[PDB]
Ligand binder design. Structure first.
Ligand SMILES: [K+]
Ligand SMILES: [K+]
Ligand SMILES: [K+]
Ligand SMILES: [K+]
Ligand SMILES: [K+]
Ligand SMILES: [K+]
Ligand SMILES: [K+]
Ligand SMILES: [K+]
Ligand SMILES: [K+]
Ligand SMILES: [K+]
Ligand SMILES: [Mg+2]
Ligand SMILES: [Mg+2]
Length: 1331
RNA sequence: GGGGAAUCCCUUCUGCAGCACCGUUUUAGAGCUAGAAAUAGCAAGUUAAAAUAAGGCUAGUCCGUUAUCAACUUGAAAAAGUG
DNA sequence: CAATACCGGGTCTGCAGAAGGGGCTCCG
DNA sequence: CCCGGTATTG
């Protein structure tokens, strides 16, 4: 009884099949449990588990951190109120109480309904004096009068509750506020540097031009237009562009011949500038510093739209300017509409359902929707010119709380808050005492490297405390151990050295690590000259001289430099051939040069006695992000450097960690030699052993010490091991389900393990990332293509338009512009032709006018194209509009193009699976099946695990006409698993040598020919072979081209396949999140315990975690007469814990009396019920059902539908295509037959009378359509019959809306079916017998 | 052939922490005039408070949406067993 | 109860890791 | 997107 298993692992299915050595699927009588009259049932050993996708933890995390934010914001307000408590109680002992109950209806309020002053006269007067809170804030900042303590509170609380972002470090410099003054500063600095060509900036209103609500490039154009003799690409123009936030290239200004682009926003700018100043000189540093200051002022002027010399509240003044312009323009608009369009006034100003002013203020119309609505109304009237300008500036009738206030820094709000505190502390002493406390409430921020301020009950926290006491914003530095916490943040996540598992890894930018990388690469360099017999390694002295002369004088070392500045200069070689390195060295001493620029003491860096110190310094710079903490840690070294050097040091920062520890690189020593790994890399006689050789050499202690260093740990469980794999959670859910399926199948075969297990794994918002990429790329390029052709993210899902923007509107193979309106006439071409690499991503595609201009089609684009286009391609690459892989493949021709080795490798890659995750699946199954060791203590591999790629079975299907149509039913998953088992077992029976390629555990033209013809033994004629294929050595039959194909056909024709939908409890959010207005409906759910939804609104649409079958009695009528019921009650996610804690009490609270506790049945989503005539339903919820049957369409119809619809591609030969076409035409009647099938099924099982009649009518309407189109729309038709939830579909232009099953009553008397994972073991419960 | 390691350039995905801005909901921001009222005419509108999973105990400036789940028997449970 | 229709909260900064092309020096 | 909740209309 030998058998194999085939598995098809996906993100929503695991297909499975059992085969015998004859490639047949067995069938068994399985026992049926329960209370029906059926005791057993015949099952085929083939099927597929279906499940909803496993989800990532991201949404859960976003909601978790948002929860924390709400908690802490409330705590800020609570701190402020605790500071105000006593004095407020003297002024008004219920102010804070009225604030707390402001949400309650007057009936529920325990105090006066007017929050601020508690009487209507004073409240109305307040709102009249201060129509916005920004009025009050400006008044309290500017006035010198004693203010009412309640108004002071409201201003401070408003600033603290909505406090602005923390994107900018430090204080908001008052020097860099004025645009005019900083523009003059930049001009003065430039004219200092360029006395012969000064700039005349008098009469230039720099403020108006540079702060105008316009695009960066337009403002640059305007300013340059105010300067005759100066162009926007000259030096001053580039400085202005850098100030405005563009990415100017200073290459041409300073004649660099190598690009020097600068963007103040990028993280690398600080180095980029220091990279430019290195080539230009340090006299230009003040010029770029002036540019940065001007940039800060322009950024501020974006938010502060008012003069900062009439008020210390420019932000509140700008909000008040919004309010005043809103008022004036609304008065004008009302007057103009009343005069010119009186009939539209009611709609514009009263109808909240429309997107006019009423919908804008009272309805749900956004600012953008209101603009779009009212723009034509302004265009049709006269006197609306300035209003239209404001609308196009997005500056018309604005509110003050708006989507763009995210631009406001917290330093602005802090300025206003501090000003108020300074005004009013002269009258309230508790404000003087607590001023810094209140400022700290605004400014204090839990660092991202500290985490939740927990006390042992958070699986997320890592913060440690210096003293056990409550943490507040004011004692945080004293109570939280910031250093230990920031260190734990990183060290919970960084790797240990795999060779020394108790050793932490070195910083990536450590001096020792970079020395290691440089010497490890340098020991394998070889050189040869004329008088040398063979190439020679570099000696220790030569390597040391190369490091001291080249690596310690240049950031990068090229082969050319090696030849000229070392071999010529030192060794007196005029010609030398180098091997082991190409073009330039990969490793380099970048940290050495950074630190040499900072400390300016080469002798310090070269003195080994400072190694420790330098290591620690880099450690600090890597471990911490906060510059104050960095300075604290570096303090011990302050006596070694000047204070300017210390400031430069603490401004330097690094990130990233290496792969090896310090103890491995330069700690452990070979016993005999006394040398470390790095010692050997610096000098190792004439063997020049590199790292791998060193740790694998039996004549050194390194291997032995690495072996001893391995430590034991607690082995993960199966679920733990699967969760810790690298991959999407969806594929991991599939992986675990696969293991459980295999366990059940082995149990089904009497605990006999299979001979083979063949596994195949499936291959695998968005427009937002596409838009992001195109925006950043065009910005880096400096192109105007988005100005001339604006595009929304959705449109970028079109392949050709996306490619058009990625290529900056140009042909990729020809130096010409493309025309947008002509995309349909252009071609999308594969860089590496798809006949070698099946890659259809953007990474292997380009848009070109005509693909013929690539060159020959049998290779990579020609060398001529590369010569033409390489510089444009490099510009695209630096703009991130193409990747390094795309650039390398486009330019491969100059490197020889595609070789025969490359093509053979491409074919092998197409056939042999090499993904790490599939290898991990194979290892899991192999270690579970094979557990015994032989006399040599090697594993006994009694079960062979074979991995296949989908292409093998796909090609098998297409070659032998075992076609698949995914839409017909779910059987194709199971058929895939079956064909996987067949092909894999036959393949390794035919070529056992292939086991290394395909079984887990253990000339170019020739291999190309071989792997391209590996599946020919199935065929009868090629491009002829015997009818019986055998193994050449064992002589055993592997394939019989008579019976075995008929066996496969019989398997695929079997109507009884075990499709099982995994029943799952539902988890997640309680309900829809929308907070609905109050309504007289029991559907509403209170958002807080006492917030009666009929008064306060609430949620609806809760999610049912699972249903429950209740047999009980319910009171009926006014008399409350008990009546027996049997019904389905949906337990919601929110109710689940309460129901499970005590079900009887819960059901009695819901109204059920005398519950039959032992008759309660838990019914998760997709619980299966069978009714009459084989009709099946699945539970969608407590009140809705899903389709429960599979339509087993016969195989001839499936193949006719595949051929008639042109499913996939025809391929083959024209004669075979003609035979397929003649088959389609000879079996046209199949169409009607297929329809009949559907109809029959729909009448037995679906019961959608109206939809079925509409479908039959639509089919009889398009009987004159081409056979191909009728076949495609018949493919569409199977949505009516598919398993699962009903869904709308389209037959030609007719739309069929889904017929839903809006009642679950019938299943309460049907047969409930409990299924095991394979569906082979069943328990059937007749529910009509309950009650 | 298979498996593995460091470096370089890129790319994708996964996990975690810390912020901001809005949105929504109820209340507050005295609507006026005529008319008995039904209604009509006009005025007005930009702001705020509070909640933002119900909530929980472990009471922290913590936790509350990921993963995992046929049924039956034995078991508090974990888990084991059952064709 | 049937047919039908509408609806659904959203976007940053920072850190660490695995793994996929392309290359290169090595190991078992 | 999808598909289960809800209301409307009957
Ligand atoms: K009251
Ligand atoms: K000019
Ligand atoms: K609105
Ligand atoms: K190189
Ligand atoms: K750092
Ligand atoms: K010093
Ligand atoms: K779940
Ligand atoms: K889910
Ligand atoms: K590698
Ligand atoms: K099940
Ligand atoms: Mg809360
Ligand atoms: Mg709001």
């Amino acid at each position: 009884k030998k058998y194999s298993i085939g598995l098809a692992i996906g993100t929503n299915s695991v297909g499975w099949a059992v085969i015998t050595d004859e490639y047949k699927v067995p069938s068994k009588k399985f026992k049926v449990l329960g209370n029906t009259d059926r005791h057993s049932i015949k099952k085929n050993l083939i099927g597929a588990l279906l499940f909803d996708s496993g989800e990532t933890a991201e949404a859960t995390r976003l909601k978790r951190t948002a929860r924390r934010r709400y908690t802490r914001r409330k705590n800020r307000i609570c701190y402020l109120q605790e500071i105000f408590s006593n004095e407020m109680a003297k002024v008004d002992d219920s102010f804070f109480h009225r604030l707390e109950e402001s949400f309650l209806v007057e009936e529920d309020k325990k105090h006066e309904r007017h929050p601020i002053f508690g009487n209507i006269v004073d409240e109305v007067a307040y709102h009249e004096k201060y129509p916005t809170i920004y009025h009050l804030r400006k008044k309290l900042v500017d006035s010198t009068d004693k203010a009412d303590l309640r108004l002071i509170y409201l201003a401070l609380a408003h600033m603290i509750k909505f406090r602005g972002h923390f994107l900018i470090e430090g204080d908001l410099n008052p020097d860099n506020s004025d645009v005019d003054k900083l523009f003059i500063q930049l001009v003065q600095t430039y004219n200092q540097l360029f006395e012969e060509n000064p700039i005349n900036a008098s009469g230039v209103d720099a403020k108006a031009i540079l702060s105008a609500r316009l695009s960066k490039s337009r403002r640059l154009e305007n300013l340059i237009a105010q300067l005759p003799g100066e162009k926007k690409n000259g030096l001053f123009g580039n400085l202005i562009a850098l100030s405005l936030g563009l990415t100017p290239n200073f290459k041409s200004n300073f004649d660099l011949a190598e690009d020097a682009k600068l963007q103040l926003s990028k993280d690398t700018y600080d180095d980029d500038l220091d990279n430019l100043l290195a080539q230009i000189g340090d006299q230009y540093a003040d010029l770029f510093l002036a540019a940065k200051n001007l940039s800060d002022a322009i950024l501020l002027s974006d938010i502060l739209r008012v003069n900062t010399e009439i008020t210390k509240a420019p932000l509140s003044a700008s909000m008040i300017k919004r309010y005043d312009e809103h008022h004036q323009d609304l008065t004008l608009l009302k007057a103009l509409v009343r005069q010119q369009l009186p009939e539209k006034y009611k709609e514009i100003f009263f109808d909240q359902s429309k997107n006019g002013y009423a919908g804008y203020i009272d309805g749900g119309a956004s600012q953008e929707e209101f603009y779009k609505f009212i723009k034509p109304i302004l265009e049709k009237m006269d006197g609306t010119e300035e209003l239209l300008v404001k609308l196009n500036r997005e500056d018309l009738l604005r509110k003050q709380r708006t989507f763009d206030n995210g631009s406001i820094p917290h330093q602005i709000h802090l300025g206003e808050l501090h000003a108020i505190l300074r005004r009013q502390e002269d009258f309230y002493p508790f404000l003087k005492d607590n001023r810094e406390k209140i400022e700290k409430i605004l400014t204090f921020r839990i660092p991202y490297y500290v985490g939740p301020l927990a006390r042992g009950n958070s699986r997320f926290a890592w913060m440690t405390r210096k003293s056990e006491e409550t943490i507040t914003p004011w004692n945080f530095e004293e109570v939280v151990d910031k250093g230990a916490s920031a260190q734990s943040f990183i060290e919970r996540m960084t790797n240990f050295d795999k060779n020394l598992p108790n050793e932490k890894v070195l910083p990536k930018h450590s001096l020792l690590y970079e020395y290691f990388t440089v010497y490890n690469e340098l020991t394998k360099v070889k050189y040869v000259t004329e008088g040398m017999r063979k190439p020679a390694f570099l000696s220790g002295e030569q390597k040391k001289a190369i490091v001291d002369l080249l690596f310690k004088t240049n950031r990068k070392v090229t082969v050319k430099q090696l030849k000229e500045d070392y071999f010529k200069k030192i060794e007196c070689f005029d010609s030398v051939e180098i091997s082991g390195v190409e073009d330039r060295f990969n490793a380099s001493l970048g940290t050495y040069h950074d630190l040499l620029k900072i400390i300016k003491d080469k002798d310090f860096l070269d003195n080994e006695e400072n190694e420790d110190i330098l290591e620690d310094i880099v450690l600090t710079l890597t471990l911490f992000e906060d510059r104050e903490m960095i300075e604290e840690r570096l303090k011990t070294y302050a006596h070694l450097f000047d204070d300017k050097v210390m400031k430069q040091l603490k401004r330097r920062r690094y990130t990233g960690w290496g792969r090896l520890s310090r103890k491995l690189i330069n700690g452990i020593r070979d016993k005999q030699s006394g040398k470390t790994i790095l010692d050997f890399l610096k000098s190792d006689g004439f063997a020049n052993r590199n790292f791998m050789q060193l740790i694998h050499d039996d004549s050194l202690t390194f291997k032995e010490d690495i072996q001893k260093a391995q430590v034991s740990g607690q082995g993960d469980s199966l679920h733990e091991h699967i969760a810790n794999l690298a991959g999407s959670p969806a594929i991991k859910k599939g992986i675990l389900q696969t293991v459980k399926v295999v366990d059940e199948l082995v149990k089904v075969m009497g605990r006999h393990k299979p001979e083979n297990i063949v596994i195949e794994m499936a291959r695998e918002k968005n427009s937002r990332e596409r838009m992001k990429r195109i925006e950043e790329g065009i910005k880096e390029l400096g192109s105007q293509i988005l100005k001339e052709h604006p595009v929304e993210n959705t449109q970028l899902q079109n392949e050709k338009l996306y490619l058009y923007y990625l290529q900056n509107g140009r042909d990729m193979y020809v130096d010409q512009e493309l025309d947008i309106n002509r995309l349909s006439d252009y071609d999308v071409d594969a860089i590496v032709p798809q006949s070698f690499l099946k890659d259809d991503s953007i990474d292997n595609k380009v848009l070109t006018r005509s693909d013929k201009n690539r060159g020959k089609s049998d290779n990579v684009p020609s060398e001529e194209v590369v010569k033409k286009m390489k510089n444009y391609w490099r510009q695209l690459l630096n703009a991130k509009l193409i990747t390094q892989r795309k650039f390398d493949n486009l330019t491969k021709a100059e490197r020889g193009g595609l070789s025969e080795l490359d093509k053979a490798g491409f074919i092998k890659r197409q056939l042999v699976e090499t993904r790490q995750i599939t290898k991990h699946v194979a290892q899991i199954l192999d270690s579970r099946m094979n557990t015994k060791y032989d006399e040599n203590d090697k594993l006994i591999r009694e079960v062979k695990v074979i991995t296949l790629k989908s292409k093998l079975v796909s090609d098998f299907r297409k070659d032998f006409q075992f076609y698949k149509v995914r839409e017909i039913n779910n059987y194709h998953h199971a058929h895939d698993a079956y064909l996987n088992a067949v092909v894999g077992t036959a393949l390794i029976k035919k070529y056992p040598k292939l086991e290394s390629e395909f079984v887990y555990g253990d000339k170019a033209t020739a291999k190309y020919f071989f792997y391209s013809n590996i599946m020919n033994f199935f065929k009868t004629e090629i491009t002829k072979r015997p009818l019986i294929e055998t193994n050449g050595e064992t002589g055993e039959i592997v394939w019989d081209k008579g019976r075995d194909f008929a066996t496969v056909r019989k398997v695929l024709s079997m109507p009884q396949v075990n499709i099982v939908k995994k029943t799952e409890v539902q988890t997640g959010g309680f309900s829809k999140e929308s907070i609905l207005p109050k309504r007289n409906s029991d559907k509403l759910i209170a958002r807080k315990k006492d917030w009666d939804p009929k008064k306060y609104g609430g949620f609806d649409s809760p999610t049912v975690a699972y249903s429950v079958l209740v047999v009980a009695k319910v009171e009926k009528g006014k008399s409350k007469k008990l009546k027996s019921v049997k019904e389905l009650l949906g337990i919601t996610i929110m109710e689940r814990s309460s129901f499970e804690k005590n079900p009887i009490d819960f059901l009695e609270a819901k109204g059920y009396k005398e519950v039959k506790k032992d008759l309660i049945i838990k019914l998760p989503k997709y619980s299966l019920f069978e009714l009459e005539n084989g009709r099946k339903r699945m539970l969608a919820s407590a009140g809705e059902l899903q389709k429960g049957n599979e339509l087993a369409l016969p195989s001839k119809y499936v193949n006719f539908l595949y051929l008639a619809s042109h499913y996939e591609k025809l391929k083959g030969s024209p004669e075979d295509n003609e035979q397929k076409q003649l088959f389609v035409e000879q079996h046209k009647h199949y169409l009607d037959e297929i329809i009949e099938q559907i109809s029959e099924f729909s009448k037995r099982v679906i019961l959608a009378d109206a939809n079925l009649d509409k479908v039959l009518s639509a089919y009889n309407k398009h009987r004159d359509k081409p056979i191909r189109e009728q076949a495609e729309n018949i493919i569409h038709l199977f949505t009516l019959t598919n398993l699962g939830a009903p869904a709308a579909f389209k037959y030609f232009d007719t739309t069929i809306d889904r017929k839903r099953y809006t009642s679950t009553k019938e299943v309460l008397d049907a047969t409930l079916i409990h299924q095991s994972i394979t569906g082979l073991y069943e328990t059937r419960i007749d529910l009509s017998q309950l009650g």
